[PDB]
Structures are given as C-alpha cells and as structure tokens.
Amino acid sequence: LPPGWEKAMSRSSGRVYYFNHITNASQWERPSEPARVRCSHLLVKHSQSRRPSSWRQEKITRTKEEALELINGYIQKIKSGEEDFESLASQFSDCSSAKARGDLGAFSRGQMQKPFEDASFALRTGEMSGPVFTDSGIHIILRTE
C-alpha cells in the first residue's frame, strides 16, 4: 500500500475505495521517492488567499467554500474526460502559469510550499491530486514527470 493510501467504504454504494490523505486523491481501483518531479497545477484563489488577485480578476472575492466547489467541478470534468486538465488550467487557473497550461517545471523538495510539495512527491507519474490547500488558495496538481 503506497505512501499515504488507505482503504475506505463509499457512502453511496458501500463499495470499497482508496483514498490518499496526502494528495486527497480518491479512486475505486487499488493503487500501484524521486529526487525531482515535474508538475502542472490549476489554482483557484479565494478571499483569504495571501494575494487575492490574479490575471483573471483584480479583486478575488469568492469564499474559500466557493473556491472548493469550483475545484470539485473541475476535477469532475477532468475525470469524466469532458475537459482536459491543461485546457481548464489555461482558462481558469488564478496564476500566471495558466499561460503554460499550468506547467511549473521540475523541482526538488525544499522549493515549494509544504502541502504542495508533499502532494507532488506522493503522486505517481501521470496521477492527479484532489484539492490541495496552500496559503495561495486551492490547487489541483498533475504530476507529469
């Protein structure tokens, strides 16, 4: 059982699923440290973000709860295949990295904010996180390398 993964019972169906408390990822299928990882992300900011401002909106007023609902809806569309991660990041991420389809490049430990770093290094290549909270706001993280 890879780092951070636990077994749980779905409320709706009673079927077993798997949850990762470090990445906040969840999935039905049973799952499965590098010096560097490469990640893309989609950031949704809220009124308590350290800098409640982005290229999308000079004053970001949405509540943290409203930001989480936006993040949840993006995760739904990405997982259904209705939308691609990069397309949503390019359009909706509250971050200049949107112009790069969310790409942050490669980094090692000791460079990024702790919740973001821990989730990034707990992901497998190609895997996506659930909502990850930092002082900047709420992130969806995609490990690409």
PDB file of C-alpha atoms in Angstrom:
ATOM      1  CA  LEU A   1       0.000   0.000   0.000  1.00  0.00           C
ATOM      2  CA  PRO A   2       1.877   3.048  -1.339  1.00  0.00           C
ATOM      3  CA  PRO A   3       2.609   6.050   0.906  1.00  0.00           C
ATOM      4  CA  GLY A   4      -0.493   7.889   2.047  1.00  0.00           C
ATOM      5  CA  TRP A   5      -3.123   5.432   0.774  1.00  0.00           C
ATOM      6  CA  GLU A   6      -5.923   3.959   2.892  1.00  0.00           C
ATOM      7  CA  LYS A   7      -8.990   1.817   2.258  1.00  0.00           C
ATOM      8  CA  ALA A   8     -12.486   3.171   2.900  1.00  0.00           C
ATOM      9  CA  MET A   9     -16.167   2.444   2.292  1.00  0.00           C
ATOM     10  CA  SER A  10     -18.235   4.532  -0.103  1.00  0.00           C
ATOM     11  CA  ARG A  11     -21.313   6.133   1.444  1.00  0.00           C
ATOM     12  CA  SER A  12     -23.425   5.841  -1.696  1.00  0.00           C
ATOM     13  CA  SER A  13     -22.646   2.270  -2.753  1.00  0.00           C
ATOM     14  CA  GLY A  14     -20.916   0.581   0.165  1.00  0.00           C
ATOM     15  CA  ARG A  15     -18.127  -0.467  -2.195  1.00  0.00           C
ATOM     16  CA  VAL A  16     -14.506  -0.281  -1.086  1.00  0.00           C
ATOM     17  CA  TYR A  17     -12.396   2.554  -2.467  1.00  0.00           C
ATOM     18  CA  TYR A  18      -8.960   4.042  -1.894  1.00  0.00           C
ATOM     19  CA  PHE A  19      -8.097   7.478  -0.556  1.00  0.00           C
ATOM     20  CA  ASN A  20      -4.746   9.245  -0.238  1.00  0.00           C
ATOM     21  CA  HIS A  21      -4.679  11.726   2.623  1.00  0.00           C
ATOM     22  CA  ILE A  22      -1.542  13.467   1.312  1.00  0.00           C
ATOM     23  CA  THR A  23      -2.834  14.178  -2.203  1.00  0.00           C
ATOM     24  CA  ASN A  24      -6.562  13.996  -1.364  1.00  0.00           C
ATOM     25  CA  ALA A  25      -6.905  11.660  -4.344  1.00  0.00           C
ATOM     26  CA  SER A  26      -9.645   9.027  -4.322  1.00  0.00           C
ATOM     27  CA  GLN A  27     -10.294   6.120  -6.689  1.00  0.00           C
ATOM     28  CA  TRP A  28     -12.048   2.739  -6.889  1.00  0.00           C
ATOM     29  CA  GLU A  29      -9.070   0.742  -8.168  1.00  0.00           C
ATOM     30  CA  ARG A  30      -6.256  -0.393  -5.884  1.00  0.00           C
ATOM     31  CA  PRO A  31      -3.235   1.900  -6.368  1.00  0.00           C
ATOM     32  CA  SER A  32       0.141   0.818  -7.773  1.00  0.00           C
ATOM     33  CA  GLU A  33      10.948   8.686  -3.812  1.00  0.00           C
ATOM     34  CA  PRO A  34      12.299  10.579  -6.838  1.00  0.00           C
ATOM     35  CA  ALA A  35      14.720  13.446  -6.302  1.00  0.00           C
ATOM     36  CA  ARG A  36      12.721  15.703  -8.646  1.00  0.00           C
ATOM     37  CA  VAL A  37       9.184  15.781 -10.020  1.00  0.00           C
ATOM     38  CA  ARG A  38       7.569  17.929 -12.677  1.00  0.00           C
ATOM     39  CA  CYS A  39       4.006  19.119 -12.095  1.00  0.00           C
ATOM     40  CA  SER A  40       1.263  21.224 -13.601  1.00  0.00           C
ATOM     41  CA  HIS A  41      -1.437  22.780 -11.456  1.00  0.00           C
ATOM     42  CA  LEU A  42      -4.707  24.691 -11.572  1.00  0.00           C
ATOM     43  CA  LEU A  43      -5.101  27.250  -8.795  1.00  0.00           C
ATOM     44  CA  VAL A  44      -8.428  28.671  -7.620  1.00  0.00           C
ATOM     45  CA  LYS A  45      -7.943  31.650  -5.328  1.00  0.00           C
ATOM     46  CA  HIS A  46     -10.359  32.943  -2.698  1.00  0.00           C
ATOM     47  CA  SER A  47     -10.864  35.980  -0.481  1.00  0.00           C
ATOM     48  CA  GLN A  48      -8.385  34.721   2.155  1.00  0.00           C
ATOM     49  CA  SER A  49      -5.603  33.942  -0.333  1.00  0.00           C
ATOM     50  CA  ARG A  50      -2.339  35.660   0.574  1.00  0.00           C
ATOM     51  CA  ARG A  51      -2.669  37.724  -2.632  1.00  0.00           C
ATOM     52  CA  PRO A  52      -6.411  37.724  -3.526  1.00  0.00           C
ATOM     53  CA  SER A  53      -5.690  38.848  -7.086  1.00  0.00           C
ATOM     54  CA  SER A  54      -4.930  37.145 -10.390  1.00  0.00           C
ATOM     55  CA  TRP A  55      -4.696  37.761 -14.113  1.00  0.00           C
ATOM     56  CA  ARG A  56      -8.377  36.727 -14.216  1.00  0.00           C
ATOM     57  CA  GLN A  57      -9.702  39.134 -11.584  1.00  0.00           C
ATOM     58  CA  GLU A  58      -8.109  42.162  -9.934  1.00  0.00           C
ATOM     59  CA  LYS A  59     -10.017  41.575  -6.665  1.00  0.00           C
ATOM     60  CA  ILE A  60     -10.895  37.958  -5.907  1.00  0.00           C
ATOM     61  CA  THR A  61     -13.985  37.890  -3.698  1.00  0.00           C
ATOM     62  CA  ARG A  62     -15.174  34.282  -3.793  1.00  0.00           C
ATOM     63  CA  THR A  63     -15.247  32.483  -0.477  1.00  0.00           C
ATOM     64  CA  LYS A  64     -12.948  29.568   0.252  1.00  0.00           C
ATOM     65  CA  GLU A  65     -16.025  27.332   0.158  1.00  0.00           C
ATOM     66  CA  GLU A  66     -16.946  28.678  -3.288  1.00  0.00           C
ATOM     67  CA  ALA A  67     -13.378  28.084  -4.484  1.00  0.00           C
ATOM     68  CA  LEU A  68     -13.560  24.490  -3.268  1.00  0.00           C
ATOM     69  CA  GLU A  69     -16.801  23.955  -5.194  1.00  0.00           C
ATOM     70  CA  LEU A  70     -15.113  25.291  -8.337  1.00  0.00           C
ATOM     71  CA  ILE A  71     -12.175  22.920  -7.787  1.00  0.00           C
ATOM     72  CA  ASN A  72     -14.535  19.978  -7.253  1.00  0.00           C
ATOM     73  CA  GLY A  73     -16.347  20.757 -10.507  1.00  0.00           C
ATOM     74  CA  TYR A  74     -13.094  20.954 -12.465  1.00  0.00           C
ATOM     75  CA  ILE A  75     -11.991  17.609 -11.014  1.00  0.00           C
ATOM     76  CA  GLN A  76     -15.315  16.115 -12.106  1.00  0.00           C
ATOM     77  CA  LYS A  77     -14.921  17.337 -15.685  1.00  0.00           C
ATOM     78  CA  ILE A  78     -11.307  16.167 -15.866  1.00  0.00           C
ATOM     79  CA  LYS A  79     -12.164  12.712 -14.523  1.00  0.00           C
ATOM     80  CA  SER A  80     -15.158  12.351 -16.874  1.00  0.00           C
ATOM     81  CA  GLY A  81     -12.998  13.359 -19.832  1.00  0.00           C
ATOM     82  CA  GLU A  82     -15.413  16.179 -20.662  1.00  0.00           C
ATOM     83  CA  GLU A  83     -12.458  18.550 -20.274  1.00  0.00           C
ATOM     84  CA  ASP A  84      -8.704  18.201 -20.265  1.00  0.00           C
ATOM     85  CA  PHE A  85      -6.615  19.350 -17.267  1.00  0.00           C
ATOM     86  CA  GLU A  86      -4.433  21.626 -19.409  1.00  0.00           C
ATOM     87  CA  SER A  87      -7.443  23.245 -21.083  1.00  0.00           C
ATOM     88  CA  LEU A  88      -9.007  24.105 -17.746  1.00  0.00           C
ATOM     89  CA  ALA A  89      -5.700  25.303 -16.330  1.00  0.00           C
ATOM     90  CA  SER A  90      -5.143  27.549 -19.362  1.00  0.00           C
ATOM     91  CA  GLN A  91      -8.597  29.093 -18.980  1.00  0.00           C
ATOM     92  CA  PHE A  92      -9.281  29.188 -15.268  1.00  0.00           C
ATOM     93  CA  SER A  93      -6.142  28.958 -13.125  1.00  0.00           C
ATOM     94  CA  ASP A  94      -5.656  32.078 -10.945  1.00  0.00           C
ATOM     95  CA  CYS A  95      -1.959  32.032 -11.717  1.00  0.00           C
ATOM     96  CA  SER A  96       0.415  33.255 -14.427  1.00  0.00           C
ATOM     97  CA  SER A  97       1.303  29.597 -15.032  1.00  0.00           C
ATOM     98  CA  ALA A  98      -2.054  29.356 -16.860  1.00  0.00           C
ATOM     99  CA  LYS A  99      -0.256  30.651 -19.968  1.00  0.00           C
ATOM    100  CA  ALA A 100       1.891  27.489 -19.757  1.00  0.00           C
ATOM    101  CA  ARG A 101      -1.160  25.198 -19.391  1.00  0.00           C
ATOM    102  CA  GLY A 102      -0.372  25.019 -15.685  1.00  0.00           C
ATOM    103  CA  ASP A 103       3.192  23.728 -16.049  1.00  0.00           C
ATOM    104  CA  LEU A 104       5.535  24.640 -13.191  1.00  0.00           C
ATOM    105  CA  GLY A 105       8.558  22.694 -14.440  1.00  0.00           C
ATOM    106  CA  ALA A 106      10.658  20.357 -12.340  1.00  0.00           C
ATOM    107  CA  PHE A 107      11.536  20.929  -8.687  1.00  0.00           C
ATOM    108  CA  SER A 108      13.037  19.045  -5.758  1.00  0.00           C
ATOM    109  CA  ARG A 109      11.978  19.060  -2.133  1.00  0.00           C
ATOM    110  CA  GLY A 110      12.624  22.300  -0.296  1.00  0.00           C
ATOM    111  CA  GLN A 111      11.385  24.647  -3.049  1.00  0.00           C
ATOM    112  CA  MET A 112       7.563  24.700  -2.906  1.00  0.00           C
ATOM    113  CA  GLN A 113       5.024  25.314  -0.147  1.00  0.00           C
ATOM    114  CA  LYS A 114       4.772  22.254   2.057  1.00  0.00           C
ATOM    115  CA  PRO A 115       1.238  20.996   1.225  1.00  0.00           C
ATOM    116  CA  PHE A 116       2.030  21.369  -2.468  1.00  0.00           C
ATOM    117  CA  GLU A 117       5.417  19.637  -2.186  1.00  0.00           C
ATOM    118  CA  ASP A 118       4.064  16.700  -0.165  1.00  0.00           C
ATOM    119  CA  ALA A 119       1.244  16.090  -2.604  1.00  0.00           C
ATOM    120  CA  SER A 120       3.539  16.415  -5.619  1.00  0.00           C
ATOM    121  CA  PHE A 121       6.029  13.827  -4.375  1.00  0.00           C
ATOM    122  CA  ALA A 122       3.262  11.437  -3.255  1.00  0.00           C
ATOM    123  CA  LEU A 123       1.808  11.347  -6.773  1.00  0.00           C
ATOM    124  CA  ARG A 124       2.857   8.809  -9.363  1.00  0.00           C
ATOM    125  CA  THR A 125       3.746   9.961 -12.863  1.00  0.00           C
ATOM    126  CA  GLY A 126       0.523  10.846 -14.651  1.00  0.00           C
ATOM    127  CA  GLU A 127      -1.548  10.942 -11.454  1.00  0.00           C
ATOM    128  CA  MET A 128      -3.745  13.858 -10.345  1.00  0.00           C
ATOM    129  CA  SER A 129      -4.392  15.116  -6.843  1.00  0.00           C
ATOM    130  CA  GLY A 130      -7.596  16.090  -5.150  1.00  0.00           C
ATOM    131  CA  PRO A 131      -7.943  19.584  -3.690  1.00  0.00           C
ATOM    132  CA  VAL A 132      -4.642  20.688  -2.144  1.00  0.00           C
ATOM    133  CA  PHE A 133      -4.722  23.733   0.129  1.00  0.00           C
ATOM    134  CA  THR A 134      -1.967  26.340   0.460  1.00  0.00           C
ATOM    135  CA  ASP A 135      -1.851  29.979   1.506  1.00  0.00           C
ATOM    136  CA  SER A 136      -2.300  30.808  -2.202  1.00  0.00           C
ATOM    137  CA  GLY A 137      -5.629  29.004  -2.466  1.00  0.00           C
ATOM    138  CA  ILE A 138      -6.782  25.568  -3.621  1.00  0.00           C
ATOM    139  CA  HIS A 139      -4.775  23.582  -6.190  1.00  0.00           C
ATOM    140  CA  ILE A 140      -5.328  20.606  -8.445  1.00  0.00           C
ATOM    141  CA  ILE A 141      -1.918  19.050  -9.122  1.00  0.00           C
ATOM    142  CA  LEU A 142      -0.948  16.876 -12.096  1.00  0.00           C
ATOM    143  CA  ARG A 143       2.388  15.062 -11.893  1.00  0.00           C
ATOM    144  CA  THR A 144       3.812  14.895 -15.411  1.00  0.00           C
ATOM    145  CA  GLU A 145       7.370  13.644 -14.790  1.00  0.00           C
TER     146      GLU A 145
END
